[PDB]
Amino acid sequence: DFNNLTKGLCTINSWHIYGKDNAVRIGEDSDVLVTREPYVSCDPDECRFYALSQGTTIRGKHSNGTIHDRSQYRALISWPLSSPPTVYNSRVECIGWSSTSCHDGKTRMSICISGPNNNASAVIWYNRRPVTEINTWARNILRTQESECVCHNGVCPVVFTDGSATGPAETRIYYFKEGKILKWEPLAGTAKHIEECSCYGERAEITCTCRDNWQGSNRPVIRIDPVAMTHTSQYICSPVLTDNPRPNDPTVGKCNDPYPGNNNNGVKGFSYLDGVNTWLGRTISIASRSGYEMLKVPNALTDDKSKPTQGQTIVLNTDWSGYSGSFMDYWAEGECYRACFYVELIRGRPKEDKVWWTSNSIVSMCSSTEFLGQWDWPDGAKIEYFL
Amino acid sequence: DFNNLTKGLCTINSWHIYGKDNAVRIGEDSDVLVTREPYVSCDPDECRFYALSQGTTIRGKHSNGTIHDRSQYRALISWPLSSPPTVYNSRVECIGWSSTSCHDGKTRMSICISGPNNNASAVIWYNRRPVTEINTWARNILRTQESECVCHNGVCPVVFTDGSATGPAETRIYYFKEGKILKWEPLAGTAKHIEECSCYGERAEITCTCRDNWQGSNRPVIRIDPVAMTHTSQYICSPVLTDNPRPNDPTVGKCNDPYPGNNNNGVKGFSYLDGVNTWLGRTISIASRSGYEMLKVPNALTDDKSKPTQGQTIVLNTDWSGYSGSFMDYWAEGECYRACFYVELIRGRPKEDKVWWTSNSIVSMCSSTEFLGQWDWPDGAKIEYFL
Amino acid sequence: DFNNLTKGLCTINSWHIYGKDNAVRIGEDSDVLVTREPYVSCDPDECRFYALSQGTTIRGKHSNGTIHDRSQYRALISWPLSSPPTVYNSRVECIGWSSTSCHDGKTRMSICISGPNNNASAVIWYNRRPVTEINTWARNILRTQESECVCHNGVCPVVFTDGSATGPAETRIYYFKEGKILKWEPLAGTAKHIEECSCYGERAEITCTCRDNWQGSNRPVIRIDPVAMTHTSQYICSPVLTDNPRPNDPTVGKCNDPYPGNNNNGVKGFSYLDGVNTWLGRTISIASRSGYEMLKVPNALTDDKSKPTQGQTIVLNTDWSGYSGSFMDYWAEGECYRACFYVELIRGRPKEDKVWWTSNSIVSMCSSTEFLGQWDWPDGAKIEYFL
Amino acid sequence: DFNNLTKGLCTINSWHIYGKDNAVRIGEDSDVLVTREPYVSCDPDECRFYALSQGTTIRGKHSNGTIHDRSQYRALISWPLSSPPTVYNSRVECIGWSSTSCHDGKTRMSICISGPNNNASAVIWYNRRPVTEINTWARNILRTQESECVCHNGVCPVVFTDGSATGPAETRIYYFKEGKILKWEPLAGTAKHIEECSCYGERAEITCTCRDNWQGSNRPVIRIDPVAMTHTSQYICSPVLTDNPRPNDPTVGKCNDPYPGNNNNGVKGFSYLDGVNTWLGRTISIASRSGYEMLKVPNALTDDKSKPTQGQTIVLNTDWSGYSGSFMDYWAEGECYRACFYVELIRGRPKEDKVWWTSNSIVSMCSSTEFLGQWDWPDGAKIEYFL
Ligand SMILES: COC(=O)[C@@H]1C[C@H](C(=O)O)O[C@H]1[C@H](CC(C)C)NC(C)=O
Ligand SMILES: COC(=O)[C@@H]1C[C@H](C(=O)O)O[C@H]1[C@H](CC(C)C)NC(C)=O
Ligand SMILES: COC(=O)[C@@H]1C[C@H](C(=O)O)O[C@H]1[C@H](CC(C)C)NC(C)=O
Ligand SMILES: COC(=O)[C@@H]1C[C@H](C(=O)O)O[C@H]1[C@H](CC(C)C)NC(C)=O
């Protein structure tokens, strides 16, 4: 049967290490594919790492220029937890340069979009075979979440966006079931721009924390109802701004508008909005994608004045970070859903340009009800060795 | 039970990306085997890429001279969809330099022919064990389809050819069932020469579009009946000639004779003859194997005057193409058979001779009922990196 | 159902070769991960090699400095028996720099501890998903056995230690069941210091032979009761001292105190205390970790005067050895539990410093009731080839 | 249930290609292990290649000196049919420098012998776990078949030899069942010396064709009865001598004595003694291990004057050959047992000494009832590329 979001989030008193692949370190001497936009996603019997390959190894020569986001050589691949996406272990889910993937409890739905900027198309795969296609509707880079979607009794919502990435665009929430479109609706609510949504589900409710790439430094939130196939948007009120770049933390935030200071930019990110048990993610730097932390910000979603009451350093401020998304092993044993997340430790261009490539590692963690000590999880590689 | 061709072809209003392995790109730095004559074929629980290995990696030194078609080091290998045929992932189906393979719904039948030009032999494997052998009957390079065959209630027809490749030869249609020969018949119909057939089945009918290597630029078609174990040959009337090389498109074509202009040459190819829902494949160039397109030519099979009413670019005219064959996931969910095909993106010799090898990548697509945007799918490699 | 320790140890009249991976030899030309602290552990349907990867290949450049014990790039990996821990075959059980792992008959429990020296945390995984966490309690390198634990009717005891490694510390015996803590107790008995325990079970009794890293050269023994969840500590009376370094063998040993001569040092080790059928392991050298032997010392556990009555050379005195732990295929056929053990053949730093790395191979053997001839099992590699 | 030899041999009117791995070619650029003494053996659901690894890749530096037969780094490995024994695909069955392996229909029994020349020991594994050990009985290199054994209703006979390899020695026929010794008997019959036996079974009878390494150029035959656990020895009467080196073919051969001309040497080999349907194998050269042929010698086993009535070239006289053994897919479909065999194409030392290694490829073929054309199957590699 299809998995149903019947549990709530477990209490998050800290975060324990869940997974790390050290792909860039290892890939300096093994056949590791170049990637970006990774994520983690579970099936009923296993969890795996996911990402968009560049169709080349890091040590390979075609790794030169992998700083590019959309090429015909990209594809969503998945592989064994905490292992490196290698040419021999990676499994191609589908071909494209933007994806999302989730398991409905019975089987998996993976979606890859591919094509030219002005005329791309998305293909929904279910049970490893293509079932539905969706053509661009705004003709300007059709794109999806870049992280696991969430299903409920067969329904798996997926947030898409088509149009400008620096002004109003056409965002849509699609409701699929066995790869077939049951219904889709345009973005409603007060969020003024939706990009790469990070989602999670619990108690029949799916919460996606995305990124306002044009005006907000205070990421938008899209709360979805998988049963009524309806949703709503907004922002995280809290003054603890979580995008990047982003102006410094104010004392009050905006709930239904983008908090200004930075335009036309940002980084995929996530959060766990669950009352007092609410945790946020943010790069530590406000200027670039470096260092990453988790901060317990009670009621951030609604308390336009909320500040951290606890936190945890994930990646030091002197180490490279990047994309961060949420996933949960919905098939795990227990009375609740252990909240997990991943951080993308980008290496290479643009920041480290003595190499011609751009790749990343992965570090993943899940919540603990204990109050555990922390450690920073760097990619670990030495660009020097790559010169 | 054995799968039965009980559906018709789905409407083809466009073509979506199905698979791509970027083997030559990746193989520049990983252990990827040298190949040619690839194809795609599905089982009830998965689909895979297939090809004739050269028994050597691309970066390997024995890759030197892999421009040769028949050596004792060749063999039909299959591997995971959209992955590169590597030394560690490729599975040897059988040994030979010409094959065909299909699944009857219960298990798979793969056939490899091997041996000296004047005295080769074919071996039919069923359920991964050899069952039947067939010796040359014309003593001049025994050869098969080079792409998936099609079964119906246990019967899987396979088109063979023995004799000259530049004049009359002995072509036969064999009817196997569990690897055993039930019956074989000589080529009947008006087709004057049959080489490397591309087939597909629907509504108890198997249609193979082959290539008249000696006189036709307008590929022959062999329509087979798996129940009555009888067939018939002809050509595609349409003036939209689909072989290569080939003279320019006339206004009227030949239905029961080879359309002249080019002799003793051509390229394996496919087509989907289904009334108005009829689609053709052809290299874009008329001189060499470069660029590839799909064109909706209603009734091409019977309308000796038919012209394109719609089309789609698969590979740009400035990129290398090659062999193209048809396959369909006959075990997919749905009311019809989604038509798919693959294009072989040959790299190396003879066209690109600064390297001593000849290999290829793979790009595969299946039909969509939507009207999707297009993108060209190049191999992606840079021979420069290989020097 | 959960496996139950219902058999006794088979008679040990000699030791036959069980497993060897020649990872350092092979890894000189293949992608083999750098490791340390290996072990062997069985499931109901297979046995595998285990170890703490360094997140890098031996030939890789990040192998430089792998002499370090705790980094964020370490992780417990398992792979196919007698094969080398490669980047493509190794499976990540969990992330950390100290582990233990056992199967309760139904599924496996693996534990990895990770973090900064002054504030680490342990994570218990059961059935491949995290279930329980345990924070440092003495704030000075939380650590576990470094070898397989043993379960009984669902209960799997694990010996931990936190605090100084050169003076009194806090050792605890935890009793888990399906990853959940049922109960834990502090170290009782007369053992004055517990480090890296090697355990085995038979007839409802679990016996762990650990290492007194601060004062004893005569390793301590912790006998555990999985049903009553109670234990007891002591030392091996025998004068045949089995740690390293260690003073020369006296005529009488200590039963309830550390036998002096060497302080603040040692090597993980094991033993089989079973009446007259009692066998010990020890490096042959008394100065460093080189050469390894097995010696039948009847009643060593209680006979403060016992001497060898038989023995077997495992690794010559002129070859590098290291850690040694016990495991038994508790799911094997037969009336008893064939005692097995592994020896870690460390290569590289500190002893062989012309290379910048530190890795190891593995050699494993199990007891025979026959009286078999012996052979020494060297790592086999040549550091010269690595320069 | 256990497989039972209930069929007879199919008629052998020719031989078709079954398997080839091109390991040395491929291994010039991929991580292929160095091996010798290969063979092929089937289980109820698959067939695989087997051999004794050298614990190193061909391109690896430890490949230097792999000309040696017994080292502590050797081990019996098995892998996917027609693929190369790679570091990532090879599976270690057991550790040793002499093996044999067969499947009784329920599970597999593999045996590896290891140790010093004057005091080795054999370990019998059943269902992948060690069960029985057997110590040397003549104290001079304990050794087995080097090719698949044959079982009947649970009983799997294995021919061993201990003592001189150039004079009388102690050969024994062991009868195992689930790895346990049921009974063993010393070599009886008129064969004066037994080494590396090649066996096959049909109609409750197991026939092993071995090699008289001290006096015979006309290989001995040991016919075994798996039910009565009794056997008998002899030689192949035929004057078509099949060992190597060997004097030229006489007109009459010896039935119960070694045919003289060459002493203290030979090559593992096989044959199919089945009345008129009797086929022999022999290197084509009489001086070294080069070229290989199959010859239909009716009644060779009993007709001390029999000459070839038909034959087939397997490997040309100008290509390297070596060991040859028999195997049959006893679980194949059909009314008879298709006779198969493998030839070891040794490369490197001693013949080709510009390299410091010694490895091999594999070529395998099975009988056809057809009269198929032939082709020679060379290893394919170019030692030049290895310099
Ligand atoms: C696959 O490429 C990415 O994820 C790129 C990576 C890049 C980044 O932020 O580093 O922006 C993503 C881009 C987002 C817009 C908002 C700039 N999405 C697509 C589909 O092009
Ligand atoms: C395996 O080799 C091929 O597929 C070769 C490849 C070559 C080509 O067209 O590029 O012709 C094929 C040849 C066809 C005749 C018509 C020239 N078939 C065989 C079995 O030799
Ligand atoms: C993973 O690291 C090890 O096993 C190290 C290896 C090192 C050795 O003896 O070679 O000591 C272990 C150390 C033990 C104390 C007693 C010195 N344990 C930890 C968790 O740091
Ligand atoms: C594993 O080594 C072999 O197979 C060696 C290979 C060598 C050969 O003939 O090339 O002789 C085998 C030798 C046979 C005696 C009769 C010389 N057997 C053992 C166990 O040492």
Domain ranges of chain B: 1-387
Annotation: binding site of B for Ca(2+): 212, 216, 243, 265
Query: Whose alpha carbon is nearest atom 12 of ligand 2?
Result: B69
Q: Is A243 annotated as a binding residue?
A: yes
* Residue B81 three-state SS: coil
CA distances from C175 to A226, B343, C58, C226, C293 (A): 42, 60, 37, 8, 32
Question: Which is nearest to C249 in space by CA: C235, C238, C263?
Answer: C238
The DSSP element (H or E) to which B161 belongs, if any, is strand B156-163
Q: Work out the number of other CB atoms within 10 angstroms of the CB of residue B203.
A: 11
Output the six-digit token pair for B137. 């009957």
Output the six-digit token pair for C190. 């007369």
- C-alpha to C-alpha distance for C26 and C23, rounded to whole angstroms: 5
Strands A220-225 and B310-320: unpaired
Known catalytic residue: A88?
Answer: no
Check the CA dihedral D302-D304-D306-D312 and report its sign. positive
Residue of C18, C50, C200, C323 marked active site = C323
Q: How many alpha carbons fall within 13 Å on the CB side of residue A176?
A: 27
Listed in sequence order, the residues at least 6 apart from B299 whose beta carbon sits closer than 8 Å to its beta carbon are B238, B275, B276, B278, B306
- C-alpha to C-alpha distance for B251 and B237, rounded to whole angstroms: 11
- C-alpha to C-alpha distance for A132 and A129, rounded to whole angstroms: 10
Q: How many alpha carbons fall within 13 Å on the CB side of residue B345?
A: 26
Burial class from Cβ neighbours inside 10 Å (0-12, 13-18, 19+) for residue C363 reads buried
CB burial string D254-276: b at 16+ within 10 A, e below: bbebbbebbbeebbbbbbbbbee
DSSP conformational letter for C348: E
A329 within ligand 1 shell (Cβ under 6 A): no
- C-alpha to C-alpha distance for B333 and B330, rounded to whole angstroms: 9
CA distances from B65 to B68, B307, B353, C366 (A): 6, 41, 11, 51
Strands A8-9 and A336-337: parallel
Question: Which is nearest to C116 in space by CA: A293, A378, A310?
Answer: A378
* Residue C137 three-state SS: coil
- C-alpha to C-alpha distance for B119 and C335, rounded to whole angstroms: 60
Strands D336-337 and D8-9: parallel
CB contact under 8 A, A72 and B374: no
Residues in chain C with CB shorter than 8 Å from the CB of D112 are 17
Q: Work out the number of other CB atoms within 10 angstroms of the CB of residue C373.
A: 19
Output the six-digit token pair for B314. 């698969």
Q: Work out the number of other CB atoms within 10 angstroms of the CB of residue D145.
A: 28
**SS3 letters across D231-256:** EEEEECCCCCCCCCCCCCCCCCCCCC
DSSP conformational letter for D125: E
Structure-solving method: X-ray
Residue of B nearest to D375 (CA): B115
Output the six-digit token pair for B237. 């009337």
State the amino acid at position A346 in one-letter form. Answer: I
The label of the residue with tokens 């049967």 reads: A1
- The three-point CA angle A346-A351-A354 to 5° equals 105
CB burial string D42-72: b at 16+ within 10 A, e below: bbeeebbbbbbbbbbbbbbbbbeebbeebbb
Question: Which is nearest to B219 in space by CA: B171, B271, B272, B166?
Answer: B271
**Phi/psi at D172 (5° precision):** -140, 150
Residue of D50, D126, D200, D323 marked active site = D323
Report how far apart the first and last C-alpha atoms of chain A are (Å, whole number). Answer: 52
Strands C230-235 and D205-209: unpaired
Output the six-digit token pair for B154. 């246990």
> Which conformational region is residue B306 in: left (phi greater than 0), alpha (psi within -120 to 50 degrees), or beta?
beta
Q: Please state the atom number of ligand 1 nearest to the C-alpha of residue A268.
A: 9
* C239 near D CB under 8 A: no
Q: How far is C-alpha D364 from the chain's CA centre?
A: 12
* Alpha helices, H only, chain A: 23-26, 383-386
CB contact under 8 A, D332 and B129: yes
CB contact at 8 A, C339 and C200: yes
Report the side by side order of strands in the sheet with B220-225: B198-202, B205-209, B220-225, B230-235
Output the six-digit token pair for D232. 């008998």
- C-alpha to C-alpha distance for D248 and D263, rounded to whole angstroms: 14
CB burial string A15-29: b at 16+ within 10 A, e below: bbbbbbbbbbbbbbb
CB contact at 8 A, D276 and D344: no
The label of the residue with tokens 């045949």 reads: C240
Question: Which is nearest to B299 in space by CA: B248, B255, B256, B245?
Answer: B255
Report how far apart the first and last C-alpha atoms of chain C are (Å, whole number). Answer: 52
- C-alpha to C-alpha distance for C228 and A232, rounded to whole angstroms: 56
Compute, in degrees rounded to 10, the torsion defined by CA atoms B18, B22, B23, B25. Answer: 180
- C-alpha to C-alpha distance for A339 and A369, rounded to whole angstroms: 11
Check the CA dihedral A324-A330-A333-A335 and report its sign. positive
What is the 3-state composition of chain C as percent helix, strand, coil, each rounded to the nearest 5? Answer: 5, 45, 55
Strands C8-9 and C358-368: unpaired
The DSSP element (H or E) to which B319 belongs, if any, is strand B310-320
Report the side by side order of strands in the sheet with A98-103: A98-103, A108-114, A121-126, A129-135
CA distances from B287 to B63, B244, B261, B351 (A): 27, 7, 12, 12
CA distances from B342 to A130, B294, B315 (A): 15, 11, 11
- C-alpha to C-alpha distance for A370 and C51, rounded to whole angstroms: 27
Q: How many alpha carbons fall within 13 Å on the CB side of residue C297?
A: 25
* A130 near B CB under 8 A: yes
CB contact at 8 A, B19 and B362: yes
CB contact at 8 A, B93 and B74: no
The number of the ligand nearest the C-alpha atom of B68 reads: 2
CB contact at 8 A, B86 and A88: yes
Query: Whose alpha carbon is nearest atom 7 of ligand 1?
Result: A69
State the amino acid at position B86 in one-letter form. Answer: T
Cis before B260? omega within 30: no
* Alpha helices, H only, B114-217: none
DSSP conformational letter for A203: T
Annotation: binding site of B for substrate: 36, 70, 195-196, 211, 289
State the amino acid at position C112 in one-letter form. Answer: C
- Ligand 2 center–CA B239 separation, angstroms: 26
The DSSP element (H or E) to which B386 belongs, if any, is helix B383-386
- C-alpha to C-alpha distance for C358 and C320, rounded to whole angstroms: 12
Q: What is the CATH number of domain A1-387?
A: 2.120.10.10
- C-alpha to C-alpha distance for D52 and D95, rounded to whole angstroms: 9
- C-alpha to C-alpha distance for B280 and B220, rounded to whole angstroms: 13
Burial class from Cβ neighbours inside 10 Å (0-12, 13-18, 19+) for residue A302 reads middle
* A319 near C CB under 8 A: no
Q: Work out the number of other CB atoms within 10 angstroms of the CB of residue A56.
A: 30
Question: Which is nearest to C273 in space by CA: C248, C300, C292?
Answer: C300
- Ligand 3 center–CA C69 separation, angstroms: 6
Burial class from Cβ neighbours inside 10 Å (0-12, 13-18, 19+) for residue B204 reads middle
Question: Which is nearest to D51 in space by CA: D25, D31, D21?
Answer: D21
Q: Work out the number of other CB atoms within 10 angstroms of the CB of residue C80.
A: 20
CB contact at 8 A, B355 and B387: yes
- C-alpha to C-alpha distance for B2 and C142, rounded to whole angstroms: 59
CA distances from D257 to C194, D260, D273, D301 (A): 68, 9, 18, 13
- C-alpha to C-alpha distance for D344 and D333, rounded to whole angstroms: 27
The DSSP element (H or E) to which A14 belongs, if any, is strand A14-20
- C-alpha to C-alpha distance for D242 and D269, rounded to whole angstroms: 8
Q: Is D243 annotated as a binding residue?
A: yes
- C-alpha to C-alpha distance for B51 and B99, rounded to whole angstroms: 9
Output the six-digit token pair for C278. 């009692």
* Residue C192 three-state SS: coil
CB contact at 8 A, B7 and B111: no
Nearest-CB residue to B366 (from A92, A130, A178): A130
Listed in sequence order, the residues at least 6 apart from D226 whose beta carbon sits closer than 8 Å to its beta carbon are D5, D150, D151, D152, D153, D155, D156, D157, D175, D201, D204, D205, D206
Known catalytic residue: A31?
Answer: no
**How many angstroms separate the CA of residue A205 from the nearest CA in chain B?**
30
State the amino acid at position D121 in one-letter form. Answer: S
- C-alpha to C-alpha distance for C227 and C277, rounded to whole angstroms: 25
Listed in sequence order, the residues at least 6 apart from A13 whose beta carbon sits closer than 8 Å to its beta carbon are A367, A368, A369, A370, A371
CB contact under 8 A, C368 and D133: yes
